[model samples]
Target: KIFKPEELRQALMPTLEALYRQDPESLPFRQPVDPQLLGIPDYFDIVKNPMDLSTIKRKLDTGQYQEPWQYVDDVWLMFNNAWLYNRKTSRVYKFCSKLAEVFEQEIDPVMQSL
Candidate 1:
């Protein structure tokens, strides 16, 4: 029913850090794109508290948040928290569904062009 956005990023950190440790010698934004897992901007800096799904949806829809990696960033909180807490609830599914929607509608086509 309630969650902290600030801690969501950290909650996911153990996994992120462990994965980052997999290849300490790698470079940022380079091949295989593992560097991206380290570069996610702070969740609150982009999406605000008391989250507005529609605003995020509109911004991602506008083509400005163009990179596929950025889409992952956009849904970081919702994606992780939906699984963590609200699993069976529509609230959780709604955010998860929106993430998929953006990936398919907004991000997939970019890959097609490439």
Candidate 2:
């Protein structure tokens, strides 16, 4: 049977809700989203544009959206940086890029590892 948008959306909602809160790693044996590349701030830091958020936004679009999501092999993420939430424009990032470019962090646990 064919699924329409509304039906597909409704069916997806609960799964999305569960996964949204659940650690993404718990989902399956998927390739991990590198924490280092995420550039996530410490527990209570303000959300600032780590480096080039505007440039990131300007360059991302529907076309580039398909340029392979970082974690899931070569699959595309299908969303761009500029996602509208609560009537505000929010930027998104691929975890790998975020850590390398925004967070300025490293993947290795230590200098010995690196």
Candidate 3:
């Protein structure tokens, strides 16, 4: 199939919206992490590149993502950052795990079709 940038963006829109609306657990990943407000002063140090759904949305809007894999990587990075910063027993960590699973399930078909 020919790779159409607009088509790919359109295809990814619903998947992205579904991820955000799928669960209450997704709330945290919706926006960027505020290190100062969250009391994690070392957040920037630990996470070199922070990613969130809002940022992804903005990038998509601005056409920053030229390929499907680029978007996929950002989504994975968001979850990986959470897992790296939070303990396995923490609620946030659990949320990341669950949401990552949901992401994989939701993204796979879209990726294959593209």
Candidate 4:
């Protein structure tokens, strides 16, 4: 299979936007984590790497993605960070889980077609 950058961007951009606009609960994942403001000092300790929708969008706009999976990986990273930091019983965790479900629902067919 050939990797076409334009094709990937065209498919991915809307997906990212959809996730951002999907729910009011998803607003948190749209930006970088603010440890001090959120009062989670241990966040950096637990999450070695941080990823978010805004960062992903910037990377996409700059043509940083070489492969489709790289984009997928970052999205998972953002969700994983939330799951790792927040307990499953927490609202944030639930939101992340739902958004992840939405992501797979939307991304699967795009990836297969690509």
* Residue 1, candidate 3: C-alpha displacement in angstroms: 7.7
- Model 2, 37: alpha-carbon shift in Å? 6.3
Give lDDT per model, in order.
0.39, 0.26, 0.86, 0.86
Model 3 alpha-carbon miss at residue 71, Å: 0.3
Worst ten in a row by lDDT for model 1:
25-34
List TM-score per model, in order.
Answer: 0.32, 0.23, 0.92, 0.92
Tens-place lDDT digits, model 2, residues 5-48: 34433333332233223343222212332335655434114322
What's the distance in Å from true for residue 51, model 2?
22
Give the clashing pairs for model 4: none
Best by TM-score: 3
> lDDT, candidate 3, residue 92?
84
Steric clashes per prediction: 0, 1, 0, 0
Q: In angstroms, how far off is 109's CA in candidate 1?
A: 4.4
Candidate with the larger TM-score of 3 and 4? 3
Off by over 4 Å in 3: none
Which digits, one per residue and each the tens of the lDDT, describe model 4 over residues 70-99? 999999999999999999989888889888
- Model 3, position 111, has a per-residue lDDT of 90
